[PDB]
Each structure stands twice: as C-alpha cells, then as structure tokens.
Design a protein around this ligand. Structure first.
Ligand SMILES: O=c1ccn([C@@H]2O[C@H](COP(=O)(O)OP(=O)(O)O)[C@@H](O)[C@H]2O)c(=O)[nH]1
Ligand SMILES: OC[C@H]1CNC[C@@H](O)[C@@H]1O
Ligand SMILES: [Mn+2]
Length: 545
C-alpha cells in the first residue's frame, strides 16, 4: 500500500515549520487517493499523476527545503504504487487477433502462419488489416529500385570489375538515383493532388507505372482484383473502413510512410497501435507463430554448444518436418542434428494426433486498463507482439509518442525535401537541421534520425525502431511511470520493462519468416545482393537488345 497522509506527514516532518500551501495540497491529494475505492483504474492513475505533479511543484518552488529528501522518496513510492495498481486490477482482453498486411497481395506463407493462430484460437475473432487503396505500393517500390539498380550498374559499368567499387559504394550511388525517383514520384503525387482527390492511391500509382515503366493496366487490375479477393477470403479488414483511424492525427503519418517512403513496416507500426486502442486484443506480425505447449520437448535436453535461437528454431522445424502444418518450412537447423536427436523429436511428435497438443491457445487473457504488453527478445522489447484492452492508457501514450517523434522528424526533413535538391544535398540540409535543433532531453533521439531517408535502401538502417517502433513503447512506459507525456531521454532498464512484457509461452518468435526482415537487411545480405545484381547484369541484361 502507498503511505497514507499521517505516514507522509511523519516522513516530511520539519519540527516547528509551518505547512506551506503547496505541502498541504500534496497531503490533501494523497488522502483523496486513499478514498477512491469507487473510481476507475484510469481515475486512480490520474490522481497519482496529480499527486506527483503537486510534489514536483513543491520541490521546484522550495529548492532548499528540508522536506525535499522525504518528498523525493515519496515520488519513488508513487512509481511502486502505479505498478501495484497495474498488476492488481486486470480486465478481460477482447478476443481479437490483429494482423497487418498492406502494400500488396498477401503471400500463402503469411496465410499459413495466420491459419496456425485460427486453428488453436477458435474463440478469437481475426482481423487481417489491408488497405484496399494501396495494393500497388510494393510493385511501385520494386519497379523503382530495379530501375535504380540498372541505372547504377550501367553508369559505373567501367568500375564493376574494380574491387574498390564495393557494395557500400554501389548502395551510395543507387540511393542518389532512388531519391531522385522518389522525389519525382512525390512531386508528381502532390501535383496530381488538386486535380481529382476522388482518385485512390492505386489509380495514381497505375498512371506512374503504365506511364514511365510501361506496365500493362490489364494485369495490374487483375493483380488488385486477386489481392482484394484473397484478403477478403482470409479475414480481411479494410483500413479504408476504419473511421477513427482515418479521422485521427496519426493517419497523415500512416500515408507518409505508405505513399512517400514506401515503408510498409512503419505504416504497420502506426496502424497496429490504433487498432489496439480502438478495438482491443492482441496484435501479431505475420511472421509470428503460436506458443509451443511448454512441456512438448521437456524430455529432450538442449545441447550445451548450441544457441537458444538454434534450439527454438529446431523445435518449430521438428514440428513442421513431422506434422507438415506449414508446407515448405525450412529444416536447415533440424538437419544439423545427428539421427539420435532427430529420432527423439520424431518419437515425441509421433504420439500427438491434434495441433492443440503441439501449439497452446491464448484463452481468456487479462491486462491492466493502464498498459500495453509487448514481446521481448535478448536485445529488448519488440512490437511484433502486443496485448491491450480497448482504449488502454498506454495505447494513447504510444500514439502520442509516435506523433511527437514525427513532429520533430518532419520539422527538419520536410524543408529539405521541398528544396528540389538531390539526395546528398537533401541529406546534409536535414542533418544540419538535426544538429541545430538537438537539445539535452531530445538530443540522443536526434542523431538516431540521420539515416531516415535510407530506410529500406541501405544495410543496417533501423530508424523506424526509434520513430514508430520499440523506442516509442519504452518512452510511453517511461511517460506512465514518470506521470508525464513526451519522454525523449529513455532511462528504463530491463527490470522496469519486465512489468510490460508478454510471457514467452504466448508467442513462438524464432520462426523462419522472422529471420527474413521485409524493411531492413544486414551487410552480408547487402554484399550478396550486389554480387547478384552484377551477375544478372553481366550474364543477363548487358547481353540483351
Ligand atoms: O510489404 C509489407 C511488408 C511489411 N509489412 C508489415 O510490417 C511488419 C513487420 O515486418 P517484419 O517482420 O519484416 O519486420 P522485422 O520483424 O524484421 O522488424 C509485418 O508483419 C507487416 O504487418 C506489410 O504489411 N507489408
Ligand atoms: O518498428 C519497425 C519494426 C521493428 N521490428 C518489429 C516490427 O513489428 C516493426 O514493424
Ligand atoms: Mn519480423
């Protein structure tokens, strides 16, 4: 229990000192809190917030006060009490599974993963969010990148056999051309905006494609129709019918990522938290699988020399080898084990006739009205799994974190874009604005933003995580525990974040599709892509008329 008024009066006592008005305000607010049995969890949190605010006013007003040490201890007690309020007052989570697949047709691989969740959660309504207006974004991005690859290989043909023209130099020159093609597209998009705003994204994208890359609108229309038909058959839920999201102050950010940046991961980041806030339930990336029954492989000991990641992937690969639930699932880890260990997996699985004996169900989940729970890995929290009741306090804090992060980004980036200059010029203008605008609080967040323009086009560019992804979640949890909004300087450690984490039992994260990121790539994949592009040029395109 949080200290009562008598107990704080004892802690912050200063003999023969008159009670300041600001001090009595804290004592009155504390006493009111202890008499809020009839009130909601959010009302109780907002009272604690008020008490923390009144305590900060006292400390800021009377800088040298003898009460200040005890009041700073009381501030620690308020944080502890928020955690007790969070952990002790749970309400049911709406039985909704939310997935997002935007920007193009959904692959059978995504559907096969989604179907594993449906099969062991018969009691759950499933939404696969898609955007009926933007099925051609993945096609636009692929077209433009392929064009920029060809133009780079052509322009630097003479240098391609030179090892000093490495993968890094290739991606730098390609980015110059990609930025000009993206600038050409957005200067086109916003010119066309102010002709017929009753044209959907796919309509304007078809004219860019079947103008300047000579694509067949017959086949593009077929692609849209097959995409709409397929998603409609697989629990499709259209973003364009989600009115609170369309009307809200994050929709412009969604459309920025979807249409200007072609970052479907960032767009999914913005949409998923609005789906949780507005509907409640559990969000999952399409590369996530249900938790494995915790004791399924209890009888098989992990080899000492092998990583946790190797062992978790081998368990899913064993399931898919012998039960074949997901066709064409890799066995690349499982195949590294000798016949003895392989046979132990086979004999464990040979005695199970139903998927419910392999994969666990979510069942009846509960969470705090205050919180959003987040998945985690050895590197920290990750928003590939989220649980929230409808209109949770944290869902609102996360939306506002994302909005504030985009406010700061766009304030420095958008001037540069609008000055019709090339990639490197735009980059330096942007970076100069960042270093000029940086302050003590937000400084560290700034400087994580410098590579924003490169997201999806360069190896090891992860800016999305700092804007719409995990950092926004950590900052929202800091907002909740520090009774404020707009935390930019994150000091939470894993002990703090552990209170907001989804149990490992509720998600299998170590899947085949999880190892293949759709919006980022590492140096090894970059080197291999560069070798692939030179091969397809020298042995393919160069030899053609
Ligand atoms: O063309 C795409 C690519 C990505 N995504 C969304 O972005 C999420 C994150 O993708 P990914 O798992 O590649 O990100 P990572 O786990 O590598 O950070 C996916 O689950 C989708 O909801 C999408 O909707 N369409
Ligand atoms: O924030 C970008 C991405 C980070 N990795 C997990 C994904 O769900 C997310 O979109
Ligand atoms: Mn993933």
């Amino acid at each position: 229990s949080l200290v009562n008024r008598k107990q704080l009066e004892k802690m912050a006592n200063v003999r023969f000192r008159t009670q300041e008005d600001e001090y009595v305000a804290i004592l009155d607010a504390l006493e009111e809190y202890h008499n809020m049995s009839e009130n909601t969890v959010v009302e109780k949190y907002l009272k604690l917030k008020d008490i923390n605010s009144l305590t900060d006013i006292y400390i800021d007003t009377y800088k040298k006060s003898g009460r200040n040490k005890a009041l700073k201890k009381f501030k620690e007690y308020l944080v502890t009490e928020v955690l007790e309020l969070k952990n002790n007052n749970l309400t049911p989570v709406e039985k909704n599974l939310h997935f997002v697949w935007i920007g193009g047709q959904i692959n059978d691989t995504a559907i096969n993963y989604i179907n594993q969740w449906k099969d062991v959660n018969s009691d759950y309504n499933v939404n696969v969010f898609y955007d009926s207006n933007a099925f051609l974004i993945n096609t636009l991005k692929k077209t433009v990148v392929e064009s920029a690859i060809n133009d780079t290989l052509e322009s630097f043909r003479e240098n391609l056999n030179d090892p000093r023209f490495d993968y890094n130099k290739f991606f730098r020159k390609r980015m110059e051309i990609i930025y000009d093609k993206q600038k050409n597209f957005i200067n086109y998009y916003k010119a066309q905006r102010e002709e017929n705003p009753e044209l959907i994204i796919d309509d304007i994208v078809k004219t860019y494609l079947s103008n300047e890359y000579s694509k067949e609108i017959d086949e593009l229309n077929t692609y849209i129709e097959e995409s709409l038909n397929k998603i409609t058959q697989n629990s499709g839920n259209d973003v364009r019918n989600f009115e609170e999201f369309k009307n809200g102050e994050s929709f412009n950010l969604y459309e920025q990522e979807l249409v200007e940046r072609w970052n479907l991961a960032a767009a999914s980041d913005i949409l998923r938290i609005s789906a949780l806030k507005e509907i409640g339930g559990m969000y999952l990336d399409v590369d996530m699988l249900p938790g494995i029954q915790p004791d399924l492989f209890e009888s098989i000991e992990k080899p000492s020399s092998v990583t946790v990641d190797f062992w978790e992937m081998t368990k899913l690969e064993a399931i898919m080898k012998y039960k074949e639930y997901i066709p064409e699932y890799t066995s690349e880890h499982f195949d590294m084990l000798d016949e003895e260990v392989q046979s132990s997996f086979e004999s464990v699985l040979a005695s199970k006739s139903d998927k419910s004996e392999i994969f666990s169900s979510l069942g009846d989940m509960e969470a705090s009205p205050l919180e959003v729970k987040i998945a985690f890995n050895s590197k920290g929290i990750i928003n590939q799994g989220l649980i929230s009741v409808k209109d949770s306090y944290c869902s609102n804090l996360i939306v506002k974190q994302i909005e504030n992060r985009y406010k700061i980004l766009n304030n420095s980036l958008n001037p540069a874009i609008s000055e019709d200059n090339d990639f490197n010029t735009t980059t330096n203008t942007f970076i100069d604005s960042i270093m000029a605008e940086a302050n003590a609080d937000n400084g560290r967040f700034m400087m994580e933003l410098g590579k924003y323009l490169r997201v999806g086009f360069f190896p090891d560019v992860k800016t999305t995580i700092n804007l719409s992804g995990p950092e926004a979640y950590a900052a929202a949890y800091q907002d909740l525990l520090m009774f404020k909004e707009g935390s930019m300087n994150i000091h939470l450690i894993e002990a703090d974040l552990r209170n907001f984490e989804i149990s490992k039992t509720n998600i299998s994260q170590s899947t085949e599709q999880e190892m293949a990121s759709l919006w980022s790539f590492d140096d090894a994949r970059a080197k291999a892509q560069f070798e692939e592009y030179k091969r397809n040029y020298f042995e393919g395109s160069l030899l053609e008329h």
